[PDB]
């Protein structure tokens, strides 16, 4: 789910997210972009 991913893996890319309270969707987007992983190995769902 959106929220669990970031809270579980913000510790990995700590500098990724802004310190403000941002929704899990965009936070996950930005953190995964900051991971620089291939687009095919994963997918963004509308809820997961």
């Amino acid at each position: 789910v959106f929220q669990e991913f970031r809270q579980r893996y913000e510790i990995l890319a700590a500098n990724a997210i802004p310190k403000g309270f941002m929704d899990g969707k965009q936070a996950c987007i930005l953190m995964i972009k900051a991971l620089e992983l291939d687009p095919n190995l994963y997918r963004i769902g509308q809820s997961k």
């Binding site: 809270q7 579980r8 913000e10 510790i11 700590a14």
Partner: protein, 148 residues
Amino acid sequence: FSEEQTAEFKEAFQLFDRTGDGKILYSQCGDVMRALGQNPTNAEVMKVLGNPKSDEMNLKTLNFEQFLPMMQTIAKNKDQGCFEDYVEGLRVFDKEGNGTVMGAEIRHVLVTLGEKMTEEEVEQLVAGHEDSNGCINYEELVRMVLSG
């Protein structure tokens, strides 16, 4: 570096000498280094200790002459783990984010992870801060350890 603080350095070095001349065991001199604010992991200590073995560490001491380049190499770290690291990692280490962290889990994951320490080490570390909930406020203890 400078003789500015080398006086305190000398008195501390000779303070913990078992022979009283300027020869202090490798474990002991690392402990003094850590007591001097400069507290690195024993890994880089052995790395700059000529990569000795435990026997050499407990048999071979060090003069004050080589102690200066030794703290010089220690000062080449120029930084250690940050405070935000510790607070966020302990916050995400708890099970429910209840402003605190359980005690027994902390003791276990401290004596049984990465650098190994004895049980009484982390015991007197957490000692005094215990509570009936078993969930200690990680913030106060981590800032006490950082500032202290």
